[PDB]
Design a protein around this ligand. Structure first.
Ligand SMILES: N[C@@H](CCC(=O)NO)C(=O)O
Ligand SMILES: N[C@@H](CCC(=O)NO)C(=O)O
Ligand code: NA
Ligand code: NA
Lengths: 239, 238
């Protein structure tokens, strides 16, 4: 339901939690976040329940790290439970996802043959394992995600990270909104500009089919053929 | 002329440089910045000339540190020169200043008599040595500033840091504008909100006579008798 992600020099957990607070009004059954520090140490915290519960859990875990993604979930596939909450993982691959992967069944079956254990009942978990799978075939996270995305069917928005290389976030808009917020030496992404207003007012709205590679210093957006596309940033007048 | 300051977890040099760029339209002859990392290592860079010259020098010096102050100067006391540019230092005390300290002469002699060496011809440098002096007498940087400000006469604003304790900036508004920018786990200060728009839109204007102690997580504002005052934060997108 709500996605927020950030890639910064400063710790981003508090920014992710504030963004999720801003996305609650939409409604949801659970929420989670994962942050990775510069050494690739990932901390993931999820809760069945409200962001406030997640925030209270985070208070006893000071999550350090400048790369992170967070999500509030309105369950479609798999009952609300902590196991099914996002972020989902596949070793170092961590994903948050809005929407539905229509063809999750056949995909889940392939990945099971490839030796992947599904721990959740979500369609989402297929994204994580599949990117893990593609990445094993060689190349950067961007290249792996360019191969993964066309295999996915449905109306979805996803942000992916590799905890081993916390310097890049990949995001793909494919039926669900995502917008990039531009910072000074940091960048953010959310499913709604409203989440990011406390830290930036300058946005790039991704378009349908866009895949964005986001680092602290650059945003590069591509279509599914790997062609670079140019998207304009705009200043938001909202408060 | 322009002051920008920041206290953050992330490196702030680029934010300071961009704030100075946003203050150039006012005019100036020199500019400088100082940043301190968590271990109290201070890097100070100043240039006679344009902010671009400073930004170019900074690119060969990548300045690390989450606490910093920066300034564009329009010379009033002491000709434009790198020596007279701010920030000025007195060992670990680092200062930027807008305005004029009208009683700088009596204070300079007083601090010379007290053993300080003035390297610059500015009135500004007296602030740095005066705070350093008061701090020697004991107490926190806020307490020292509280004692120092009443000794100064003039229309001025200043932001002060102690590289030994990079977790706090002190600012005093005494006839020249200063505004605090509120961030998330970081805070900023500038002589003009225009400087800070890239990083925040929420501001607290300091009022005349206010002394603010700013950390990454809190802003505490006091008057000269040391009473805590409450100032309202405003959202302001220009
Ligand atoms: N299908 C995924 C995501 C549902 C969601 O939150 N959409 O906004 C799930 O059930 O977890
Ligand atoms: N009097 C100080 C600061 C002058 C000023 O405000 N310039 O804009 C000096 O001469 O350095
Ligand atoms: Na789609
Ligand atoms: Na004054």
């Amino acid at each position: 339901c709500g996605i927020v992600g950030a890639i910064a020099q400063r710790d981003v957990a508090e920014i992710l939690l504030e963004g999720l607070r801003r996305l609650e009004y939409r409604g949801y059954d659970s929420a989670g976040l994962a942050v990775v520090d510069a050494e690739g140490h990932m901390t993931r915290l999820r809760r069945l329940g409200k962001v406030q519960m997640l925030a209270q859990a985070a208070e006893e875990h000071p999550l350090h790290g400048g790369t992170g993604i967070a999500h509030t979930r309105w369950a479609t596939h798999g009952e609300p439970s902590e196991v099914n909450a996002h972020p989902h993982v596949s070793e170092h691959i961590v994903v948050v996802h809005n929407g539905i992967i229509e063809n999750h069944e056949p995909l889940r079956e392939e990945l099971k043959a490839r030796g992947y254990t599904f721990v959740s009942e979500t369609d989402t978990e297929v994204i994580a394992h599949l990117v893990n799978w593609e990445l094993k075939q060689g190349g950067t996270l961007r290249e792996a995600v360019l191969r993964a995305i066309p295999q996915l069917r449905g109306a979805y928005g996803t942000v992916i990270m590799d905890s081993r290389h916390p310097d890049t976030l990949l995001a793909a808009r494919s039926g669900s909104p995502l917008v990039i917020g531009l910072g000074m030496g940091e960048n953010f992404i959310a499913s709604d500009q409203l989440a990011l207003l406390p830290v930036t007012r300058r946005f790039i709205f991704l378009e349908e089919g866009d895949i964005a590679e986001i680092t602290r210093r650059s945003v590069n957006i591509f279509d599914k053929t790997g062609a670079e596309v140019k998207r304009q940033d705009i200043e938001s007048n909202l408060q």
